[PDB]
Amino acid sequence: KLALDRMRLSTALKKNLEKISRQSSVLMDNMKHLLELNKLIMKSQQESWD
Amino acid sequence: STKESKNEKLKEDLEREQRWLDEQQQIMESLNVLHSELKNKSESRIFNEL
């Protein structure tokens, strides 16, 4: 069930990708914040490894 | 936030364990020397000192 749902979301998201980079939406903002987080988390993970 | 807290605790634990290891190495050297010295180191003789 989960795999089917993810595939559906991926294809629908692909079909409307051009509309997304027009942006000027709350969802576009959320994506910019998400990029900032992931980077910090991965750096902290590497330091913990060492 | 949780990852940051984990990293801080890891650093503090690291310094503390380093100090403990140093002290324990000193103690081990002392024990080795003492056992070596003791290993390197009857009625008639006892009656003599009295």
Swiss-Prot record, chain A:
It comes from the Eukaryota. It is found in: Nucleus; Chromosome, Centromere, Kinetochore. Component of the CENPA-NAC (nucleosome-associated) complex, a complex that plays a central role in assembly of kinetochore proteins, mitotic progression and chromosome segregation. The CENPA-NAC complex recruits the CENPA-CAD (nucleosome distal) complex and may be involved in incorporation of newly synthesized CENPA into centromeres. Required for chromosome congression and efficiently align the chromosomes on a metaphase plate. Self-associates. Component of the CENPA-NAC complex, at least composed of CENPA, CENPC, CENPH, CENPM, CENPN, CENPT and CENPU. The CENPA-NAC complex interacts with the CENPA-CAD complex, composed of CENPI, CENPK, CENPL, CENPO, CENPP, CENPQ, CENPR and CENPS. Interacts directly with CENPK. Interacts with KIF2C and NDC80. Interacts with TRIM36. Belongs to the CENP-H/MCM16 family. This is Centromere protein H. The lineage of its organism: Eukaryota, Metazoa, Chordata, Craniata, Vertebrata. The chain holds residues 100 to 149 of 247 of the full protein.
From Swiss-Prot, chain B:
It is found in: Nucleus; Chromosome, Centromere; Chromosome, Centromere, Kinetochore. It comes from the Eukaryota. Detected in several fetal organs with highest levels in fetal liver. In adults, it is weakly expressed in lung and placenta. Residues 1-41 form a coiled coil. Component of the CENPA-CAD complex, composed of CENPI, CENPK, CENPL, CENPO, CENPP, CENPQ, CENPR and CENPS. The CENPA-CAD complex interacts with the CENPA-NAC complex, at least composed of CENPA, CENPC, CENPH, CENPM, CENPN, CENPT and CENPU. Interacts directly with CENPH. Belongs to the CENP-K/MCM22 family. Component of the CENPA-CAD (nucleosome distal) complex, a complex recruited to centromeres which is involved in assembly of kinetochore proteins, mitotic progression and chromosome segregation. May be involved in incorporation of newly synthesized CENPA into centromeres via its interaction with the CENPA-NAC complex. Acts in coordination with KNL1 to recruit the NDC80 complex to the outer kinetochore. It is linked to Chromosomal aberrations involving CENPK are a cause of acute leukemias. Translocation t(5;11)(q12;q23) with KMT2A/MLL1. This is Centromere protein K. It comes from Homo sapiens (Human). The chain holds residues 109 to 162 of 269 of the full protein.
